[PDB]
């Protein structure tokens, strides 16, 4: 079935977040955190609800989101996990802030 008009706008935002023009700051958010691979053995004790853009994309393809609010809560959860785990001066936090600016300004243009 066809996404609602608001969910079409959300899918457009998601495609933009995954696109080459934002890759320089978006790439850490592309796939789930692999805590063992990165050596962050406390990650799952601190972050109880992991989220990333590939998971948001699978949920949109599977029609899991029933409205725009549910989609936005997942994208914001992904940024909040980054702000919770890392110190505020970390390089990856600066990248999160820049991608979140892209997201919030386009989300605000919702039909
Ligand atoms: C989860 C690990 C904490 C954080 C970190 O210190 O990672 C390292 C690898 C130990 C430096 C890590 N930094 C990064 C990170 C650190 C510096 C720069 Cl310039 C870019 C991303 C990170 C890297 C990844 O590579 C596949 C995946 C997820 C990353 N991420 C996210 C999302 N949130 N925090 C991070
Ligand atoms: C940088 C804050 O964590 C998120 O700011 C969003 C604003 C639209 O730039
Ligand atoms: Cl929210």
UniProtKB/Swiss-Prot annotation:
Homodimer. Interacts with E2F1. Interacts with (acetylated) STAT3; promoting STAT3 recruitment to chromatin. Interacts with CTCF; promoting BRD2 recruitment to chromatin. Belongs to the BET family. It comes from the Eukaryota. The first bromo domain specifically recognizes histone H4 acetylated at 'Lys-12' (H4K12ac). It also specifically binds histone H4 acetyl-methylated at 'Lys-5' and 'Lys-12' (H4K5acme and H4K12acme, respectively). The second bromo domain recognizes and binds histone H4 acetylated at 'Lys-5' and 'Lys-12' (H4K5ac and H4K12ac, respectively). Chromatin reader protein that specifically recognizes and binds histone H4 acetylated at 'Lys-5' and 'Lys-12' (H4K5ac and H4K12ac, respectively), thereby controlling gene expression and remodeling chromatin structures. Recruits transcription factors and coactivators to target gene sites, and activates RNA polymerase II machinery for transcriptional elongation. Changing residue 38 to A: Reduced binding to histone H4 acetylated at 'Lys-12' (H4K12ac). Some specific inhibitors of BRD2 that prevent binding to acetylated histone are promising therapeutic molecules for the treatment of cancers or inflammatory diseases. ABBV-744, a small molecule, has been tested on tumors with success: ABBV-744 antiproliferative activity is mainly restricted to cell lines of acute myeloid leukaemia and prostate cancer and is able to displace BRD4 from chromatin. GSK046 (iBET-BD2), which specifically inhibits the second bromo domain, is a promising therapeutic small molecule for the treatment of inflammatory and autoimmune diseases. This is Bromodomain-containing protein 2. Changing residue 33 to A: Abolished binding to histone H4 acetylated at 'Lys-12' (H4K12ac). The gene is BRD2. The chain holds residues 344 to 454 of 801 of the full protein. It is found in: Nucleus; Chromosome. It comes from Homo sapiens (Human).
